[PDB]
Swiss-Prot record:
It is linked to Cornelia de Lange syndrome 6: A form of Cornelia de Lange syndrome, a clinically heterogeneous developmental disorder associated with malformations affecting multiple systems. It is characterized by facial dysmorphisms, abnormal hands and feet, growth delay, cognitive retardation, hirsutism, gastroesophageal dysfunction and cardiac, ophthalmologic and genitourinary anomalies. CDLS6 inheritance is autosomal dominant. Signal peptide: none annotated. This is Bromodomain-containing protein 4. The NET domain mediates interaction with a number of chromatin proteins involved in transcription regulation (NSD3, JMJD6, CHD4, GLTSCR1 and ATAD5). The C-terminal (CTD) region mediates interaction and recruitment of CDK9 and CCNT1 subunits of the P-TEFb complex. It is also required for maintenance of higher-order chromatin structure. The record marks 98 as: Acetylated histone binding. The gene is BRD4. Interacts with p53/TP53; the interaction is direct. Interacts (via CTD region) with CDK9 and CCNT1, acting as an associated component of P-TEFb complex. Interacts with RELA (when acetylated at 'Lys-310'). Interacts (via NET domain) with NSD3, CHD4, BICRA and ATAD5. The interaction with BICRA bridges BRD4 to the GBAF complex. Interacts (via NET domain) with JMJD6 (via JmjC and N-terminal domains); the interaction is stronger in presence of ssRNA and recruits JMJD6 on distal enhancers. Interacts with NSD3. Interacts with NIPBL. The lineage of its organism: Eukaryota, Metazoa, Chordata, Craniata, Vertebrata. Phosphorylation by CK2 disrupt the intramolecular binding between the bromo domain 2 and the NPS region and promotes binding between the NPS and the BID regions, leading to activate the protein and promote binding to acetylated histones. In absence of phosphorylation, BRD4 does not localize to p53/TP53 target gene promoters, phosphorylation promoting recruitment to p53/TP53 target promoters. Belongs to the BET family. There is a cross-link at residue 57 (Glycyl lysine isopeptide (Lys-Gly) (interchain with G-Cter in SUMO2)). It comes from the Eukaryota.
Length: 124
């Protein structure tokens, strides 16, 4: 079945709220959330509902925009680079599990190119 989702709070992890992390929630995430290809990434992969029983045998660092959202809302991150790593992990997983030109990869590559032009400039 499905593994536990990644943690969205951790009381012994130091937390911070920088200007660039506010921008990742308020601006970067909340617009990517609205893209037409955003739905498969708005929650952890449900390997049971999707009949992908091999997903979590291949992917061992799962990540998804729904986890990132709760992490941003809970001030989980020390800095913006930690949150950007989570985004890249989400995109990289999708390219590892699937193959060039799959419908899901096209969705991810569309989000990823949008993600890059949106983080091109972060606040100060
Ligand atoms: C062969 C295959 O179904 N691959 C998939 C399917 C996903 N979500 C879905 C969900 C519903 C229908 C089809 N697809 C998916 C999601 C996130 C990351 C991934 O790597 C994914 N890979």
């Amino acid at each position: 079945m499905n593994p536990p989702p990644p943690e969205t709070s951790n009381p012994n992890k130091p937390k911070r709220q920088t200007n660039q992390l506010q921008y990742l929630l308020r601006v970067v995430l909340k617009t990517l959330w609205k893209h037409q290809f955003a739905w498969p990434f708005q929650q952890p992969v449900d390997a049971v509902k999707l009949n992908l029983p091999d997903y979590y045998k291949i992917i061992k660092t799962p990540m998804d925009m729904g986890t990132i959202k709760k992490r941003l809302e809970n001030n989980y991150y020390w800095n913006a680079q930690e949150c950007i790593q989570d985004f890249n992990t989400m995109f990289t997983n999708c390219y590892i599990y699937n193959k060039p030109g799959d419908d899901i990869v096209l969705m991810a590559e569309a989000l990823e190119k949008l993600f890059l032009q949106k983080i091109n400039e972060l606040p100060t």
